[PDB]
Structures are given as C-alpha cells and as structure tokens.
Amino acid sequence: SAKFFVGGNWKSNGSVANVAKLVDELNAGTIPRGVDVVVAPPFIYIDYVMQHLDRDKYQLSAQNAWIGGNGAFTGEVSAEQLTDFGVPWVILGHSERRSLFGESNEVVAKKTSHALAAGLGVIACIGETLEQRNSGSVFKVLDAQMDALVDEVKDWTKVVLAYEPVWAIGTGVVASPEQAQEVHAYLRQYCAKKLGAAVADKLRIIYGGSVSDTNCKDLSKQEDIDGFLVGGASLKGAAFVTICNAAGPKAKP
Amino acid sequence: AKFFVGGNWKSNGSVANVAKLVDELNAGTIPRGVDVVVAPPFIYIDYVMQHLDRDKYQLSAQNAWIGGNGAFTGEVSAEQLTDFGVPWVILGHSERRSLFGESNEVVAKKTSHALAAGLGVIACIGETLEQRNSGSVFKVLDAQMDALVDEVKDWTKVVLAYEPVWAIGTGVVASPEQAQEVHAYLRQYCAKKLGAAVADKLRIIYGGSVSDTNCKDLSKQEDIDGFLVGGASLKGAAFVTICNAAGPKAKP
Numbered sequence: 001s002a003k004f005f006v007g008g009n010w011k012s013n014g015s016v017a018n019v020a021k022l023v024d025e026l027n028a029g030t031i032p033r034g035v036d037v038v039v040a041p042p043f044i045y046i047d048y049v050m051q052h053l054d055r056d057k058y059q060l061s062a063q064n065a066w067i068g069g070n071g072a073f074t075g076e077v078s079a080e081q082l083t084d085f086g087v088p089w090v091i092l093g094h095s096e097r098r099s100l101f102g103e104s105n106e107v108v109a110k111k112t113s114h115a116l117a118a119g120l121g122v123i124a125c126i127g128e129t130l131e132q133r134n135s136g137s138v139f140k141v142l143d144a145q146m147d148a149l150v151d152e153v154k155d156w157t158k159v160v161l162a163y164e165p166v167w168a169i170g171t172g173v174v175a176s177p178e179q180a181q182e183v184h185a186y187l188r189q190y191c192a193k194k195l196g197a198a199v200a201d202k203l204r205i206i207y208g209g210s211v212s213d214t215n216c217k218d219l220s221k222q223e224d225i226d227g228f229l230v231g232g233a234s235l236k237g238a239a240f241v242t243i244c245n246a247a248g249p250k251a252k253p
Numbered sequence: 254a255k256f257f258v259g260g261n262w263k264s265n266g267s268v269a270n271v272a273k274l275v276d277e278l279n280a281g282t283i284p285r286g287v288d289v290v291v292a293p294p295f296i297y298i299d300y301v302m303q304h305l306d307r308d309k310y311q312l313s314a315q316n317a318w319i320g321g322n323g324a325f326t327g328e329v330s331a332e333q334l335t336d337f338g339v340p341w342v343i344l345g346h347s348e349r350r351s352l353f354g355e356s357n358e359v360v361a362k363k364t365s366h367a368l369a370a371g372l373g374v375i376a377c378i379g380e381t382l383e384q385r386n387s388g389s390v391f392k393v394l395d396a397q398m399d400a401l402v403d404e405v406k407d408w409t410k411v412v413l414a415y416e417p418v419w420a421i422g423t424g425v426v427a428s429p430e431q432a433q434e435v436h437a438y439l440r441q442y443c444a445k446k447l448g449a450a451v452a453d454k455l456r457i458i459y460g461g462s463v464s465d466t467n468c469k470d471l472s473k474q475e476d477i478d479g480f481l482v483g484g485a486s487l488k489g490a491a492f493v494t495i496c497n498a499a500g501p502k503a504k505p
Contacts, residue, residue: 012318012325015336042329043295044337062296064327066264072422072483073264074346075316075353077294084267085296094326101353170324231324 004035004220004247005160005204005227007123008234009063009091012042018235019045023052025237031057031244034253036204036227038089038123039234043077050086061089061123064097067111079118090115091229093125095166109148112159121158123229124149125208130167142187150194156203161187162229164208169231174210177218184224213242220246256284256472256499257412257456257479259375260291260486261315261343270487271297275304277489283309283496286505288456288479290341290375291486295329302338313341313375316349319363321370331370342367343481345377347418357400364411365404373410375481376401377460378439382419391438398439402446408455413439414481416460421483426462429470436476465494472498 014022019041031037040061041049050060066076082090092115093108103111112122128141142163153159163183168175175183184205191200207219208229219225227247233239262274271293283289292313293301302312318328334342344367345360355363364374380393398413405411415435420427427435436457443452459471460481471477480498485491 009326011323012328012330012333013322014333042327042333044298044329044333046296047299070265071263072348073352074261074343074348075294076264077296078264081264081266081294081296091326096324096326100325 001202001252002204002226002250004251005206006035006037006240006244006247007061007091007160007162007206007208007227007229008037008039008240009094009229009231010039010041010234011063011096011231013235014041014045019048020052022235022237023049026058026240027052027054029057029238029241029244031241032247032251034251035244035247037244040089040091046085046087059089060087061091062087063091063094065090065092065111065115065120067107067114069114079115079120083119087120089121089123091123091125091162095125095127095129095164095169099166105145105148109152112149113152113154116153116155116158121160123160123162123206124153125162125164125229127164127166127169127208133165133167138183142183143190146187146190147194156195156199160204160206160227161191162206162208163187164229168209170210172210174212174215177222180207180209180219181222181224184222188224211243213239216243216246220248220250226250254456254478254502255286255288256503257288257290257458258496258499259313259343259412259414259458259460259479259481260289260492261346261481261483262291262293262486263315263348263483264294265487266294266297271300272304274487274489275301278310278492279304279306281489281493281496283493284499284503287496287499287503289496292341292343298337298339311341312339313343314339315343316346317342317344317363317367317372319359319366321366331367331372335371339372341373341375343375343377343414347377347379347416347421351381351418357397360397361400361404364401365406368405368407368410373412375412375414375458377414377416377481379416379418379460385417385419390435394435394439395442398442399446408447408451412456412458412479413443414458414460415439416481420461422462424462426467427459429474432459432461432471433474433476436474440476463495465491468495468498472500472502478502
C-alpha cells in the first residue's frame, strides 16, 4: 500500500498574478481519487494558496524549515510556526540547499526529526550528483545520506523519501525509467534492513528528477516508484495535473 | 533624519501572537513623522500587511535571496517582495552572518540586488566579542562598510544599522557613549567615501538590546537616528514606547 505522492515544488518563483493564475489552473484540474498531491509555494504566498487552493484536491507544503525551534533566528521559519499556521508538509534536504547552503546529511536528518516531532510530514530528499554517479559512489552516497535519516527519524509514518539525482535535477536529462528504478529498488530493500520490510513496503519512495507531462508515463509504471517530486512542470497548471494522473493502479482510493 | 525605528520579530510567531501583536501595534500612537518598520517572518507578511495600520507602519522582510527568481528551493527573491507590497528588507543580520555564513561580500551583493529590485535595505553591521576583546572593532566596520560602498550605488533607500554581537540577546546594552562613539565613526567614514552630502542624510540606527528603558538615553545621542528592536518588538506597548523615543530627531 502506497497512496501515489505527486509533489509540486514551485521553488523560488511566482508573482501575484502568476500564483493566482496557477491557483486557478490547479483548481481547474481534476485529480484522480486517492492520490496525495502537495504543492509547495515560497513562504510569502502560503497564506493565499492555503486560502484559495481547493482543500479536497491538494494539501500545502513549505519549501524549507529551520533546524531549531523559535528564538532569535532572523529570516528562518520554524517548524512549529508552520503546524500552527496549518501547513501539513515541508521539503527538507533539497539538493539546492545541501549544496548552496552547505546542509549536510546530519543537519538534514536532524532538520527532519525536529519537524516530525513538531507535527509535520517531511518530503526528505536525497540524491547524488554527476561527480558521484560517474565515480560509482552512488552506493555510498545514498547509504550515507540515508543512515543519518535512520539515525534520527523514529516514526516513518509521515516521511516521503524523494530521490532527486542532481545530475538530473535542473539539467533536463531525466533519469531513464530503468535508471531511476534500479536506484529506487535499492532504497526499498535498504530500508528493509535498517527498519524492516513492513515499514519499507509502506513507505513512499517518490522520484524527483526532471519530470514532465511526457516522461511520467514510463516512470510511474516502474515498481518501486511511488510518486514524483515535480519542479519545473509544477509551475504550469495542466502540466502538473497530467503528472498527478499518471498514478494509475498505484492510487489507493 | 526621519527617526527610523525598526522591529525585527525574528523566528517568532503564532496565529494568536502575530494577530495579538498587530492589535497592540494598531492600538498605540506613533509620533507624527517617524519611519516605523516591522519585519514579521515570511508566512505572516500577508496578514500583517492586510491588518496593520497603513498610515502608521510599514512592512519589512527578514531576509532576501542573493539572486532573482529561479530554481532556489526555500528562498524568497527581492523581486517577489516588491510586487507583493513589501518596501523594506533586513539584510546581513548578525545571526545570518554567523549561523548561515553570509559572507561580507554576499551581504553587500544582497543589498545592491535588493535595491535595484525596488526595495529598501536595512543594512546590518557589527562586531563580535572576539572582535572587541582584540580591538579589531574599527577594522571590522571598515571592511564591512567598504564592501557595501562597493556594491551600493544609491544610498537613498539604505538604513545602516549597527549591531554589536556582544550586545544582542546577551542583554548587555552598548551604553549611550559606547554606541555614540561607533555611530560617529560610521558617519565620518560615510563622508569619507560618499561625501558629507550622503552621510548627513543617511539614517544610522542602533541595534542592540534596545528596550523602553534604555531607548530614551540612546535616542539623545548625536549620531543615533533610531533603533533596530529585536526582543522589545514583540510587545506592542513597549515597541510603541521606543517609537516615541524620537522626539525632536523626527518632527514632521
């Protein structure tokens, strides 16, 4: 069992007209019954998307959350401020923060366990780069990114494990179905050792490559691909709704 | 001069408190002719803008991204703030510099980028306890203020906030004479490099452990044009008191 998870990370994008336009487009789309669909607008627009996105079809998310609680931390938004505000999800550990802000695995893991205890669900992101794929380090790279999460996370009920290959995040070369499946199969039978196949067969291992309307078809057929983390297509309305429909029989109604 | 009173709520807030603070801020009266600026965390900027008094307060962002839009998970751009209605943004806060590693040049780049995007910047500077105990104070500000003068090409919409790191949450307050000495250096160092035409008009506000108690004594000093308030900005009654510390430094 794994309700298909399509995550639409808008990333640092959007105007007043565009967010209201994308809300109208996402509201006009029809999502198949039994699919978790989560949009993640940048912090300032959450109050509006919370108030204007159709509550039955989508749930909200935040693109980041502070490692600690409240206090004197300028700029950061706490994981407690979010649950009280009404946001149910948060993306922690994107490759645009592991690299550009120096967020290590132990920080992202601690960032997730603090957000879990704050009452949130975490779309915990992992993945290697072009530097690591060629050197064959994908074996170690994910096992070190994952162990930190296992070292911290104590309840995977609300965790969604996104595999974003950085050599495929912003560059448009979507990892082929047989590539992004051989990695997802690892994470499944890897979470079976540390946790236990009962938890692993229930966990959602979505995919966070360069997903579009075209290529989600052949990815969603793969066994250990339980969903998508969509970035560029999530800014286009019907482009996101198409990918939210590629679930098929993996959608528990 | 237009006495500049900032209020940086920092990583604080709830649905009740943020709402409660706007009622407390809308309640008190602000002297006729004072620039007062509050900076809630990002998620509450919508509510405050639609509830805080237009005619008595202005909004501010606690941070902005060094670049424009694009694939940057989490961050908020300077363009995303001007179209939203925000007129101000605090950049280079001492908690940003130390915890997240905002380099001296990044903070300068963040200030000129946010200026060219239609915003105004409350530029932050200051030294640590490591930097006063070794006497590196005047060297640090010269380096932090130089990098700005490099990027910033119009100081019309820039408020320069001095923030002693040793005098933040510690509770220690840079005494009225300690914070007037520094505020006077920065002015003759802005006449240095931008001429006395820019320096006299520029707003240099003090950003230490300001409260309704010790705001009366710092507001009288010569080169102190206001305050960055962090902790006392969360009490609507105490913050409006500090906004009245202006007196003749504002007038209309």
